[PDB]
Amino acid sequence: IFLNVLEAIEPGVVCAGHDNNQPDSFAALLSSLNELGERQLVHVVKWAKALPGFRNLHVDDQMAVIQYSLMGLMVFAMGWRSFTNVNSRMLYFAPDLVFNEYRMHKSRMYSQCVRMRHLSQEFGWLQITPQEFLCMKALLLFSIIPVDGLKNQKFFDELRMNYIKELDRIIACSRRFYQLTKLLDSVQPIARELHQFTFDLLIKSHMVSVDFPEMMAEIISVQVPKILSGKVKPIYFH
Numbered sequence: 001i002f003l004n005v006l007e008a009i010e011p012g013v014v015c016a017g018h019d020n021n022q023p024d025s026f027a028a029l030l031s032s033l034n035e036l037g038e039r040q041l042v043h044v045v046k047w048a049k050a051l052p053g054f055r056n057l058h059v060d061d062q063m064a065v066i067q068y069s070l071m072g073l074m075v076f077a078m079g080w081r082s083f084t085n086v087n088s089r090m091l092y093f094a095p096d097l098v099f100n101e102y103r104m105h106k107s108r109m110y111s112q113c114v115r116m117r118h119l120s121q122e123f124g125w126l127q128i129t130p131q132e133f134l135c136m137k138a139l140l141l142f143s144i145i146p147v148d149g150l151k152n153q154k155f156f157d158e159l160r161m162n163y164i165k166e167l168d169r170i171i172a173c174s175r176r177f178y179q180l181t182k183l184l185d186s187v188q189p190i191a192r193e194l195h196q197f198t199f200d201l202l203i204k205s206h207m208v209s210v211d212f213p214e215m216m217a218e219i220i221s222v223q224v225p226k227i228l229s230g231k232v233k234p235i236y237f238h
């Protein structure tokens with residue numbers, strides 16, 4: 001049942017709407033990445049609310065959790081797409097927004113892209129199955145919270161424990177659990193760098209001609225600073 005549900009609600013392909021015949025400039029690439037974030041968020045919200053037990057969370061906690069984990073969720077899914085499509089050769093953000101070495105450099109996110117390709121490669125090196133991927137991604141949604149707790153922290157804690165149990169069931173083993181939890185932890189440092197980069201970019205967006213959609217601009221200025229200031233922190237296993 002659990003896996004049936006995860007497979008049924010998994011989001012489909014999402015395009016960035018990037019004009020590929022235009023020069024690879026910083027402004028053009030990040031305006032497209034920003035738009036893609038706006039588009040993937042829409043799918044992530046519907047995905048999360050359809051997750052087993054998610055609705056048990058307080059309404060305000062639901063939105064908060066989705067916004068705090070959006071970056072990591074997108075990174076993880078992206079690494080899996082790149083692995084399954086181009087075999088981690090390039091970064092497959094969207095069918096119409098694939099990053100090669102030139103784009104990695106022009107986006108001024110080269111170092112982060114390298115780490116993301118490393119993650120993508122892990123899917124191959126660890127021979128991660130579609131089921132493991134699905135369970136792990138669901139767990140990622142429940143991996144970052146306010147140090148002072150959510151409105152209803154007990155429900156969240158209960159749910160997170162349940163999802164950890166499901167990952168354990170899919171594996172069933174100790175070596176595998178060690179490897180998968182290590183992989184999940186590796187997403188956070190990456191998300192953090194993207195969060196920092198995104199924040200700085202928003203602040204100076206008017207000077208570098210980069211456009212940010214409404215919802216992304218709100219999340220970057222309201223939720224992301226909470227993470228960068230230490231009020232909201234990821235839940236590491238190790």
Ligand SMILES: C[C@](O)(CS(=O)(=O)c1ccc(F)cc1)C(=O)Nc1ccc(C#N)c(C(F)(F)F)c1
Nearest residue numbers: 033034036037070071074075078093198216219
């Ligand atoms: C630079 C940026 O455009 C910032 S953003 O999308 O507006 C954003 C704003 C706030 C967040 F919490 C998360 C993401 C970005 O990280 N976009 C983005 C778009 C698509 C994908 C994918 N797939 C990813 C990444 F997760 F893979 F890095 C990142």
